[PDB]
Structure formats: structure tokens, C-alpha cells
Amino acid sequence: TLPHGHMQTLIFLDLEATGLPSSRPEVTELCLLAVHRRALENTSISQGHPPPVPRPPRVVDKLSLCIAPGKACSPGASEITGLSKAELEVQGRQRFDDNLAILLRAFLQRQPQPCCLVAHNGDRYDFPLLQTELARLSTPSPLDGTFCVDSIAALKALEQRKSYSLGSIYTRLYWQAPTDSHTAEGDVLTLLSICQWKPQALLQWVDEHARPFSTVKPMYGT
Amino acid sequence: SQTLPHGHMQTLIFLDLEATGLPSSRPEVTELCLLAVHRRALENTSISQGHPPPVPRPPRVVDKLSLCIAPGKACSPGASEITGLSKAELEVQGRQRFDDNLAILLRAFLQRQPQPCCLVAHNGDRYDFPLLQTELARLSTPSPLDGTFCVDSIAALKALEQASSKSYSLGSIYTRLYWQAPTDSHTAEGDVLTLLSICQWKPQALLQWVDEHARPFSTVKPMYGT
Ligand SMILES: Nc1ccn([C@@H]2O[C@H](COP(=O)(O)O)[C@@H](O)[C@H]2O)c(=O)n1
Ligand SMILES: [N+]
Ligand SMILES: [N+]
């Protein structure tokens, strides 16, 4: 008895932004990687020690975008993300605007439903912040029929002290350092690899814990 | 007093697609990847030094779209072997056809890029661009690529390698420049990233060639009629 049925699409998501929550941050980068349930189930299962790092499914949809913020990145944010408001502006990046919502809506529409976003620390950071950015637009949110889960909770359950930083998890499971860029897409690819460690168990946990994105409280309001 | 045909391109969009077969089969697209890079990000690439130069690092600021598309006809056995895609598997995974919503998606992606914008595709003039024109011609939307320019990177790399003086396949060029094999060949995103690397070899010369040779995508003749 699942709350919202079997999820047919998992969208691995990462957001980068200008700072930490009390700073009222703005998104500077966004990556979505949509995988069908069956592509995850077709991940080959490894019983060796260490398990090889899974490769991504052949069939994936990917969207990665840089976004000009209205406010400057903190020094810590620019160091960690490698992005700056000034550099995003000189490369002509656009704000989080109605055309971006058109793009997101059309990308989501290509995915079989029910669909669930999966983000590392999404419950405390990525999801509330995405909710805030979408709430500013006059466009109705394209995510109001989408579900979501936090992969920190997923991996805590799948593993049954331990750090739950993305890199710490990857190294604990695969016993090699992560090699992805430190970009939103690199973080999404590292998360996909972690989620392919026990893909059937991950899907089961996601099905049991999916909640409507419409219930995510905005990080901050107008 | 000689002028560029369409001004300085502000965005290069590296593009590749996979499809069900070769042109005489009247193929349909099964995968599409666009990778948009601002002129300034390309010009920022560290100068290639040494023999071989290291494979350039992709710019930090890029926009990427990669999509799988259900075709209405089967892939040839050779197309499915090379690309790793089949109609049956794309359908099992619920992929949608090339439709109006996909054109709306592409348009909104393109609208985030500063203009003038130029598509860059390897063998684009004979394959990718005519095929995309055919697919877009079936739709009820305007073309999302009205206003966008295009060029074929085979001609470009022929020019640039002649200047620093052969197969001009994507892999042959990459291996000549960098002395190792590309990865993820014959996948849309893997081949886009290989093309980006080749075009980062001599970015200023590439941008000058592209500026001089860009043509409107609206002038590309469809591969076949509908
Ligand atoms: N030997 C070959 C080479 C290319 N092709 C077709 O050319 C398309 C594009 O080629 P690339 O993979 O080089 O981009 C393939 O997706 C495939 O449909 C083929 O069907 N047989
Ligand atoms: N990988
Ligand atoms: N599993």
C-alpha cells in the first residue's frame, strides 16, 4: 500500500545557489536527470566487493542550466560552486523567469507519471528553494503534480559514525573517490551512481516515501 | 570594408543527434543533444600548448539538453548496434515522439541563449540539419530554429588543420589532436562533448571561421518530404 503508487520516473536534481538559507538565496544552476523506473531496474546487480560503479542507463533525459541571480554569491558560495553573478551576467545568462518555467514544464511533460524528484538534502535546501523561485512567477508551478524525496533519508534506510555527505556515501559504497565535476550536473551524476548501488531497494524506498512537491514549504517568501 | 554575413555569433550550440538509419531510409530522430556555450566561455579556454595538448576542460558555464525520442519506425540493425537505442526500448521507457511540445522545449532552451546563435554539428550540412528540418516540418508550431544560424564542423576543422599543417570523422580528428580515443561514441551527448573538445583546440580561429560561414537554419533544405 503505497501513498502515491509506483513512481514511473525518477528525476535526479541538484540546485546551486548564492548562499545558505538565511541569506534568502537565489538559484545559479540547476540540473535535472530523468530516468525511467525500468532503466534503473535494468542496472546490473553486483555482488562483488567492491561493487563496480554502475554506469548510467543508456536512456536518460538531461537538462542543465546556469541562471543569473539577482544578488551576489557569497564568497563561500562562489568558491564552492565556481559561479559568480558577474560571470553569469557577462555570459548573458537569464534570470529564473517565465521562459524557464516553459522549458521546465515541457521537459517534465516528456516524462511518464507519476514522477518523483530525488535530491540530496532536497528536503532542507533544493526543494524549498525551487518552490520559492517558482512561486515568484505568474506561471502556475510546473511541479504541482510531481512528487519528491530526499536521498539522504533514502541512503540512511538502505544502509540500515557515518557521514551522509554525497562524496562520503559514494566512497563508502564504491571505495574510490568520486570523479565528477563540482557542478550541478556532476553532483547529479554522483547521486545517480549512489542510487544505482541497490536500485530495486532504492525504488522501493522512493515509492514508500514519495510526497507531493505541492506540500514543500517555500524556503522564504515575498 | 568587408563584413560578416550575420555578425559575431554570441552562442555556439554544439548539436548531435542519433536516428533510425542512413538518409535513404528516411530516418527519424531517436536522440538529440544541444550544448550551448557563450563566445566568451570558448575564448576563455586555456591556450593549447604542447604536443599533444591536454584535452581542453569544458567551460564551467554551459547549458545542456539531452533527450531520447521514440521514433515511428524501427531502427536498422546497424543503427541500433552503433547507437545502443531501439524503438522497442524507447517505447518500453515511455519516450514521447518528436512533437509540438518538443518544439516548445527546444524554443525555450534556445531563448535562454544570447543571439546571434549558431548550431555547430559534425556532418550537420548533410545529415543533422536536414533531418532536424524534416522533423520540425511535420509539426504545427513555427520552427523553433527560425532566427538561429548553423555551420558544419567538418569544414571548420578542415580549415583549422590546414592552417597548422586525412579522415575528418569526429573520432579521427579528436585522436589526431589529443592522441587518445574519444569516449561514448555514437551517443548524442558523448559525441557533442567530443565535438566541444575539438572546437576548444583553437577557439579564436574556430570562432572566426564560424562567424564567416554561419548561414540561417531556415535555408537548410529538408532531408526528405512529408
Ligand atoms: N554505419 C552507420 C553510421 C551512422 N548511421 C546512422 O547515422 C546516425 C548518426 O551518426 P553518428 O552516430 O555518427 O552521429 C546514427 O544514429 C545512425 O542512425 C548508421 O545507421 N550506420
Ligand atoms: N559513469
Ligand atoms: N537492489
Numbering used by the authors:
A (entry chain A): 5 to 164, 174 to 235
B (entry chain B): 3 to 167, 175 to 235
From the manuscript:
For comparison, additional structures of mTREX1–deoxyribonucleotide or mTREX1–ribonucleotide complexes were determined at 1.5–1.8 Å resolution. To understand how substrate binding depends on the base structure, the ribonucleotides in the mTREX1–RNA product (AMP) and mTREX1–ribonucleotide (CMP and UMP) structures as well as the deoxyribonucleotides in the mTREX1–DNA product (dGMP and dCMP) and mTREX1–deoxyribonucleotide (dAMP) structures were superposed. Our analysis reveals that AMP, CMP and UMP all align well, with the scissile phosphate and ribose in identical positions. Overall, our analyses demonstrate that the binding positions, relative positions and residues interacting with TREX1 are highly similar across various deoxyribonucleotides and ribonucleotides. The aromatic ring of nucleotides is shown not to interfere with the ITF signals. The results depicted in Figure 3 and Supplementary Figure S7 indicate that the equilibrium dissociation constant (Kd) of mTREX1 with AMP, dAMP, CMP, dCMP, GMP and dGMP falls between 130 and 210 μM, with no specific difference between deoxyribonucleotides and ribonucleotides.
